[model samples]
Target: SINSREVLAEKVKNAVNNQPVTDMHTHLFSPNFGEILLWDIDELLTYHYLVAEVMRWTDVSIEAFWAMSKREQADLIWEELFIKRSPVSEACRGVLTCLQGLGLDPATRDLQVYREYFAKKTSEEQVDTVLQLANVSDVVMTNDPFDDNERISWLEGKQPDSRFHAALRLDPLLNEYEQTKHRLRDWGYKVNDEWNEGSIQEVKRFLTDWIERMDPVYMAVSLPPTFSFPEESNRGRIIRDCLLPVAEKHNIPFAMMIGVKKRVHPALGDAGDFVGKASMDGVEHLLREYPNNKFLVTMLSRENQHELVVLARKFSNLMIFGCWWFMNNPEIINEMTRMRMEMLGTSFIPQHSDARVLEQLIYKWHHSKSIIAEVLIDKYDDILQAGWEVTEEEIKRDVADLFSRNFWRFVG
Candidate 1:
């Protein structure tokens, strides 16, 4: 018998909820990376999302807030965001979601109790617990060769956890070429200040060396809304001459996370970053110019979503993924996922936990799964109403594609 609409909805939910996802882009680290792997309750409360939110309701000066200890900052954020006001916002609600995932009661409203629970587990154990709770099988990390801490770990030949994978981050090389030029020379790249053949070759060498070392799934850079290619600029020159060629040679996808307006509020630190609507002209240019190379693109601005999906339809080489940063909310996710499905079918990846914290995988995936399931349920009902009989296997296969298979296939 053909399943009823209600039965189909239940099947979709079960398939989506139980599927183990490959979190494609994250700022997370393996426990072997040392203290950089954030997990504790204090870290959760003081995440930059909550840091930005807390500033709105409190009279505390930015300098004063920075001066406070991490614990102190966590306490202030908890008291202000969770107690004095409602945790109705997505970031605040995420903390409650995480607490419940860990089998803690958010109703207790006692920060210390939560802290005590986290304190019982070691960092390695916490990683296992969080990943299991999140139903995440593999997490790709944003591995920056420019960052000294991470570079040292790589140089030391420390092994990453089996579940953790790497993606080479290229912000310093692409975004701040002039500043990075001196560092490149110091690192023995022999890159000149000008973007000549010698300098271009040296930059390519640097990328090749790191790509070999990291064995990255992709090479990525976050760009501003004003980002453009094929111009008489360092960033443009590097992308045209150095970055894309090396990526093509390595046979790895290049990811461009566009539309960040860095430090709109300087006092907010990492929280200071803001978004703007980015132009799709450059992305179109890349897709057309380099038909052989794969591009995994995600934009931060909500307005950029429709144009991005349209661009994906025009280019088979392009794979659009995720509702980044500001657009990671439930409302935006629902809108974006539905639109993507309408245009791309199941060929595109719908969500990625751009999670900076280890435990954030739990709440981020938990929330995203529900929204995605809702979108799929509607889509399934639409098909079922048209007399297309949907099977459990079909629902499971589509759910797998959305969560994991699409990304792996694209990367391959």
Candidate 2:
């Protein structure tokens, strides 16, 4: 017998909530990475997202805010974002979600109370707790070879926890070739100032070395809105000559996170970046020219979503993913997820945490899952009215694909 629509909706909701996630993209590291792996309530409050939010609401000068210690910054943010005003913003509500997820009372409104709870746990324990609370089975980290601290950690032979996976991030190599080339040379790669044959090979060698070391799930870069392929630009040359070829040799997908305009408000640090609509012509060219190479692509601009999804329909090599950065809010996520599901079904990844702060895993996934469930329930209902039999097992399968399997299958 067919289940009632209400029963089907409940099944979808439960399945969505309970499905273990494979967070295919994040700025997280394991505990062995040392202080770079941020955790606890203070780190949550002082997150760059909340830092940007506090700046908008308060009259505090950017200079003065920067002058404060980490604890002071967190205190000001807690007072301004949480106490003075309602926690109305998505970032602020995320704090509440993390608190509730950890079984702390957001209603308590006491920062020290939350701080005390986090203080009781070691970072290792905190990692275990957050992963469990978020129901995330695997977390793919953004591993940058150019980052001194991270490179040092990897050089020291520190192993990541079993649940953590790596993605070799190439922002510097692709986006700032002039500056990065010198660093590459200093690191003994023999990379030169120009994109000559030897330099290109050196760059490829660098990627090969890092890929071997990291065993990354994918190789990634975040590009500006002006980014293009097959152009005479440094990024264009590197992507075409080096990155794509290296990734192809390793048989890993090349991930492009496009449309960041860095330091639009310079004083805001990581939060200073802004979005712009980017052309899809370059991406289409990559998909066309390199038919054998796989791509994991996400765009930050809201305007680009439709074109990106439609592009995926044209190329099996492309796997579109996540709401990303400014698009990670619930309203945008709901709209984007619904449109993607309509166009691509469960063939795409619905969300990624992009979480720099560890506890963020809880709220980001928890919030996105609710919206995804709402969208899926409506879709299942639509199918049911068409006399299609929708089973709970089928719903679970689809939910698992959205939450976990799709990325792994694509990468493999």
Candidate 3:
């Protein structure tokens, strides 16, 4: 599933054309995007609301899942078998129109407002318009997490070149239930607010319902160790409970995106005693004990990558995908986001990461991946400083060449 000839070319062509290359990983609500959906929530706040009014899902409908309280909306989708992280990465017009509607307005100076809204204030009323956007985000986060079709695909697309699969992120809080409660405080960038316990139950119910309805080939979970940015919780137990058992029982692969061991120079110390590996016993059990159940890993470094290769060979049923969206730039904000999940879909474009992609990446790395990831345009400089010997012109030229051939256009 990692490399497909056609999609790879298309992604390559799109990136070269500067057509906003992005891989899905987070949520892109109607209101967040300041537009209605090409795919709206229950048809209540269509894409027209997004383009014409800069709506942010204050209400809801069926086709699209907009128009509900952050709590009610979150509760409604808490137990989804499928998930959505960020769609704006692939939804081109959604971003453009949302930006246009949110045209340069007065809030640009307020870091809080600008963080929720955009730099250019088109629909100055972007955030206040909340039309609702839960259903869409769920699909983006769970189910067919990423796509190669150049658009959303219900099918899990390709897998190990032999079977089909549907991947899910087993929630500790249940679907968007916790996210719903967190979105209430309105601090814009921060989530310091009331909490909800019911959403967890809701998420479980949703997943059971999804399996019954969709009947996917396989179900998988990403109980990432240190999922949030800046590594918020010390708990890796959530993944151990929520995702592991279900996957094992269902005979589906169980996977984890390992947390980086540290965030210091020379990359050698304990990095504050962070959990470098994710649920190692969970991994070993699935591979050694439950051989039929495959294991996938999103490793952090060459050392970890090497470890994974050894494991994969020993455990033939094991499947591994290594990713590092956080690799080159320590300045870019992700202390623990498990962005390798996002990296699973992203082909190394070898250039400036797409600006919009950066935003989508930041939100997902924070909201879904459970780590901190700040969005900054200038962080590209960190690449060269990371020992890559990069200069601006070298990047431009290499990017051009990569797209032309679509080879392994690596930067560092």
Candidate 4:
């Protein structure tokens, strides 16, 4: 007979629970950055989702809403989205999970209690607390050079926290080169409106300096839903002439996050972004052309999932990851994880929180761990019924790789 469920299931569960994960992507900050990237309860509650929910259910004007202080916005979100109705939505439930993870009362509807507790703590303490709660060993942070505030912080040579590592985010450099021309010039790069050899050289200088400055673990960009390759577009030129050459020189993997259609509801600012179906053709082209290069890719379109897997079967250098944005929910994650394991096994990195909120690490991973464990158990049982016996040590090794090791190996 196969290994008993009592033995194998517990082993799988414990391995998932105890393994330390390296969170591969986030808009997070370390204490040394001297900015409040690790948001408190107020910021957490007023995050873009709850912001959208309040506007939808309470009929608040976007203009008037933007005028309120952060505290006031959170108070409104608390009253309308949490108190006035059942906190049943995924976003709403996530707040409850975060509270419980922090040893706060999930049932407590008083926003002031959360405010009071966070107020007494320092940012460093909060970072330690949140990382421990998430069981995360390393947080690969998004370091965008265009953000004036963050750029100034980097200018001071302030290092990232011990738990955090940097990833050079070059979104504007790729997707909106014209808009970034002024900023690049001010930083002493000879960038201009025209795409030419000199422009490419200046762009390369800018990237080389920042890459040397940040010493990022990898380089990344978020592409629009309609992003394509084999392009005559300026973006295509930047990719070919500027980005690929620098990444190759540095020998770092380039991450392409595709399929965002920004600002569906402009009134909400960052909260208004939405997803559209992305083409897999561009991804395949990059993989084909740069077989020497490494790419970490994730798509916003669910329709692209099966084809992405088929594509990965053809390329060793391409690593597809995470459910991403709209696809991170339980149902989609379950389907994606099962399909990935069936096709790729433990070779692929399966999940990342993509958390913009510090507390979101709690719920995103909490939900993901359950789904990943269930999928592993099902697959193990199938092997058993087919008359193969897998050892407990083997199960532990597989789960550990899915949650953590595969990410480190890919980056190296």
Candidate 5:
């Protein structure tokens, strides 16, 4: 089973606690973008609800504001909510049928075929895979669950299953913005929680309900739709105003996102301090305020690299989701490919890719596939030695030299 804490403890030991981990993430309330190509929304939820196994427990701060500025971004976030709601919302069952006939192979394990077995993979298959990789784990949290009890009950039933770990989503919009804002600045902050007074109280009450009932191991708090910075809304007000007190009073473990327009690339542009500051340093400050709290981020486009640079500088509480590959579809990936950047987290390492075009520069460059861990360590070491402020072009030059000077060593 995937929740086998005992085995997981052993796995962590083997993976080395000293090294950074990648599984600190969740689809908790999101859809199976990676697992379920997403025909509609319900099918996506069913997979996560019944199969994903990880989730956010109680976070009471979410305001659904579809920013009209970025129509595409709005569309994706909306689709994400539908995907999240599919599992618990019985009203969404009708949508489930839209995906009934669709599913993937149960026994398949190849990387290529793994693409197909997404969201629908039986719990058994996912657990087995978890046992094998054994390095990372994720929480399946949901936002604004109409029925937190049923979800908790479902998780409770699964607890005995050995591999069932739980995660909680934290929202910092528990009280009036006036009350929350000043407190954040006092705590040394620059922004708000990311929501308007707009029914923000409803979220707080929701989290309070969970705090009263279902108990979880770890939890996260953030704006409604999982954004770290204010992009399309009055983000500054919310981050500084709402999230501060909401997070402080609740006192639950939590993580948040720093989604961006850029993909994970070295050239993603963060050294200059723009929206990146909201993510890298902003999260660090929050974590400081809530020391027990955990920080989470995924390897989104190259922009995610900036966060990694911040973390590698020795920030605890912050973690990365490296295996976010399946989230985007061909179109999204194509969109991502358009950005030729290496993320701070994903690119800082060297892996044994057959192409060896990128990593060959720094790594020893074995002519076969290499574990993601190997590559990350190599890159982390070099960058740290270089004074923790190298530019993408500089990184490119260094890696380029390493790749060209390769001696093609096959000598055992």
Candidate 6:
């Protein structure tokens, strides 16, 4: 009977692997978007993290590194991070996971091998292969209306693949107002410098128009560590006047990702951003203030997680998902998952792939699924020990829900 219990645990692991993940957030682009966000192996290898890691080993200046071609960058990273130094970091090992999962040898120092593999497949073929490898049912894209390139693509009638859903991102509306209004004006909206009612209404109309055009599953903004509310700030007024009302009208969750300390080292570009502690008080206030609107929130700070777990306990409208940005590594993910389980059980989402690259879906999901399975196996054992019946069917359904239904339900 004990051995059979072990067998049931293995079945849970298998079921988790088999389930299709609804990757709630990613920067991946479909073929409709003109340029492939999935850059070559060099791009994947130079992905912000590796760019930062490579700097630690070499005396190469950021300007000098920037001057090199994509091929040169990958060569440097592969040599420094992989060959000379041990690939012990999660980000380094993640590259190996992606390569090995794709049936490629992870031991190779040859960048062309990786390049040749990607060059063989068209973008659509690569998407298909990666989705199947990751067992992803759907992926939610970050659609920023402010992005000229992205905006022009959608305007030109580039219909995305059905599996890819849009999320309207409004970082400017909340984070950078002056620049936001400039973009708004360029896009044929009449917004002023003052965060007044008129400007707020114009912003709301802009969001409504984008929502009409894209029909996004949700609306989102990524806030900084210094971000605060419950006090009368102009950005807070924009949320009250513009963001929340439009979200309520459409009846979709407003996802807020807080605590990105952008550009501590500007030389590293995107990877230059670091994490800091965020306030759960502001989140708590939002949940209380907007009872009608649903909120999907993730904290970039590990320090904010426990407070967020406690806050989510108090509000039915609030849902916490992912250990984001700097906390995207295993140590933080495992800590957050264990904490969420202890506090909220299976009520919260365990993880989300903030994967910017397409193939990264394989490693991110595979690694996350194994960790989540370990937690579930223990939880299942406890239930059986408590004299409860734990059926195989229940395990499958729960796994599916964790990977898919929970997210769709929130968005719906």
Per-residue accuracy of model 2 over 1-412 as CA lDDT, tens digit each: 3357778878888898789999999989988888999997888999999999899888889999999988899999999998899999999999999999999998888788888998778888988999998999999999998888889989988879889999998999888888888898999999766669999899888999988898999999898898888899888888889888888888999999999999999988988999999999899999999998999999999999988999999999999999999999888999899999999988999999999999999999999998999899888888888889987889999999999999999999
Show where candidate 2 strays beyond 4 Å.
none
Error of 5 at 40 (Å): 18
Which one wins by TM-score: 3 or 4? 4
lDDT of 5 by residue, 1-412 (tens): 2133343333333333222122223332222212311222223322322211211321211112212223332233324434444333322231232223223232331223433544365544544443233222222333222234434554354232323233454433331345544444453443334444543554444445555544443444432223443233444444444444454565544444443333232321221112232345455556566565444544444445444545634644544433232222233333232221233333222211111011111111111113322342344445545656434344344443222211111000
Q: Which regions of candidate 4 are displaced past 4 Å?
A: none
Whole-model lDDT values for every prediction: 0.92, 0.91, 0.33, 0.85, 0.34, 0.84
**CA RMSD for every model?**
0.8, 1.0, 17.2, 1.5, 17.1, 1.5
Per-residue accuracy of model 4 over 240-287 as CA lDDT, tens digit each = 998888888888899988888988888889889988888888989999
Top-TM-score structure, candidate number: 1
Estimate TM-scores for all models.
Answer: 0.99, 0.98, 0.33, 0.96, 0.38, 0.97
Question: lDDT of candidate 4?
Answer: 0.85
Model 1: pairs clashing at backbone N, Cα or C within 3 Å = none
Ranking 1 against 4 by TM-score, winner: 1
Better model by TM-score: candidate 4 vs candidate 5: 4
Lowest-scoring 10 consecutive residues by lDDT in candidate 5? 353-362
RMSD, model 6, all Cα superposed? Answer: 1.5
Full-model lDDT, candidate 3: 0.33
Candidate 1 per-residue lDDT, tens place, 162-227, comes to: 899999999999889889999999999999766789999999999999888888899999999998
lDDT rank order = 1, 2, 4, 6, 5, 3
> Where does candidate 3 stray beyond 4 Å?
1-24, 27-139, 142-167, 171-207, 213-252, 260-282, 300-303, 322-325, 328-412
Error of 6 at 64 (Å): 0.7
